[PDB]
Design a protein around this ligand. Structure first.
Ligand SMILES: [Ca+2]
Ligand SMILES: [Ca+2]
Lengths: 104, 274, 274
């Protein structure tokens, strides 16, 4: 895969990447969580699936949910970005999803 | 029997309260999941719901009550103590008992606040994208003289990645990051150029639905310290403009390091209301 | 009237044109997203597409048209000017509407240009990975006498990290970095042993699809300046080897700092063409 070598003007990127562990909990709630991702407590007990999706945003309380410990799921351009990430431009309006694979 | 959450002394709100300024006659709109108006330590004098089926003066979730407590927990001999104890508290419900809402719902709350004279608007909520309607709603509210405060978000950092959420990111809004009782940035505090000021957000104690109390985490807890600080200042100088109040908070803040991660620093209401 | 982007005077392309050398009769192939031949300021006299169901005479992306305009915008009375206006421009489409393309497609385009006796190849494109097939392609092109020019990349710097992409990273291809209107390296310009020379890569005004213009940023904009300089040098000394042209451009570059971030420096086609 080759991309046009122009420098893009995206605002930022969101990459729903699963993370955290019992002894090292992430901060999030079911609302702000990502669809396709599942969230568990310190004991590995299921709690909920992410309720939002990159495209089309919605409002969530900005507090960490004590019940959740972990989850399981600038020149960068849409072609240059990574699939599994959603890029937005200024005034964060959705633009595209990455097309490249993460380096190995 | 009243407890003073570390946050109050930390931002020096206690010093300002002793001078006699407690946010009297200053209206603060808490846009959230509602407030448990019947909590003995809270005094909700109004508001409105934009959530089908739920009244404004109830809170099935609990987050909106905790947020309010941090702002205006009454100063008596019970529970906790707010940053601006005499403030006029308004419950504008824009998130259902599950803590979820639509930008559409939020815009209605923002306009209600503006229209009805709120002096301060607190939004311990957000989305990762942001819309045109929301921006015009906050750009407008601020333009009408309203101090608009919002939680910066709990996405932590990631290299040089901007993780500030909306509406906190719009510059008509003050994006608030979070620190702990040691004045240290919480690891979950979002970062990025728009981060404006820090406030206590880790282990914040306050009112919680069903006349009780609880300890919560998140920039969601930091935002109401700033909104409350704004009210204190307005309590002392009613003539300041929404812009002037915003500048005192950020220009008199205690330096914590690089602006990207801490913005201007920890708010100091003693220095700001001076 | 005609506008001259800063890139032309910066690399002194004007000086050489005033000598009466404009790349006349030098065939240059722009392996990109195609070119909008119908654009008044351009004149595509051939090419080939390797993009299913799409003509090489049109450009759905815009990138190729822009790159092409820096290489050969006609020295008329309207629009912009190219580094070598009188060059025989060929659009070799190897990238789709979304600026993407498979290596094999690019390999096909490289071979084409080689088989059609192209003099210069401009690849304002790149991939993070190498490929025996691609290396062989540009290697035969160079061996056949083709001056191969590619964009180095936009990974910026980081310690001693080598962020030069492929094919630029190949030693048969001139890796081009970028600088601004002040000969200052653009922060996004990639670095490493392979960096060969620098060219204007920021705020490059050039032709844009459907008879207009735009200002883009990247090593994409810098590569064409170099491929164009290759053309001018060749129009003056018709029989120099691809190697000799390559060496004279890097050999007369004005020093700007460590070769790690500047290669030999900013190209000076006037000095190169002596
Ligand atoms: Ca109390
Ligand atoms: Ca022209």
């Amino acid at each position: 895969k080759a991309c046009t070598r122009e420098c893009g003007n995206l605002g930022f990127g969101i990459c729903p990447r699963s993370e955290g562990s019992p002894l090292n909990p992430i901060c999030i709630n079911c609302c702000s969580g990502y669809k396709g991702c599942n969230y568990y407590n310190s004991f590995g007990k299921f709690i909920c699936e992410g309720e939002s999706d990159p495209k089309r945003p919605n409002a969530c309380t900005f507090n960490c949910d004590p019940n959740i410990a972990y989850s399981r799921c600038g020149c960068t351009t849409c072609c240059t970005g990574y699939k599994g990430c959603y890029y937005f431009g200024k005034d964060g309006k959705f633009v595209c999803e990455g097309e490249s694979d993460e380096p190995k | 029997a009243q407890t003073v959450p570390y946050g109050i002394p930390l931002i020096k709100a206690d010093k300002v309260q002793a001078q006699g300024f407690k946010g009297a006659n200053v209206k603060v709109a808490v846009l959230d999941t509602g407030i448990q108006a019947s909590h003995p330590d809270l005094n909700v004098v109004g508001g409105a719901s934009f959530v089908a089926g739920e009244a404004y003066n109830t809170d099935g979730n609990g987050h909106g009550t905790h947020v309010a407590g941090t702002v205006a927990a009454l100063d008596n001999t019970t529970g906790v103590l707010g940053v601006a104890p005499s403030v006029s508290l308004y419950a504008v419900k824009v998130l259902n008992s599950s803590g979820s809402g639509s930008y559409s719902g939020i815009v209605s709350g923002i306009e209600w606040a503006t229209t009805n004279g709120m002096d301060v608007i607190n939004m311990s909520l957000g989305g990762a994208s942001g819309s045109t309607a929301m921006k015009q709603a906050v750009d407008n509210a601020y333009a009408r003289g309203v101090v608009v405060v919002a939680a910066a978000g709990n996405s932590g950092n990631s290299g040089s990645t901007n993780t500030i959420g909306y509406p906190a990111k719009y510059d008509s809004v003050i994006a608030v990051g979070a620190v702990d009782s040691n004045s240290n940035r919480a690891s979950f505090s979002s970062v990025g150029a728009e981060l404006e000021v820090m406030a206590p957000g880790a282990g914040v104690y306050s009112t919680y639905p069903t006349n009780t109390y609880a300890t919560l985490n998140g920039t969601s807890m930091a935002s109401p310290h700033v909104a409350g600080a704004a009210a204190l200042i307005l309590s002392k100088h009613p003539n300041l403009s929404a812009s002037q109040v915003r500048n005192r908070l950020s220009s008199t803040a205690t330096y914590l390091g690089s602006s990207f991660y801490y913005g201007k620093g920890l708010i100091n209401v003693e220095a700001a209301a001076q």
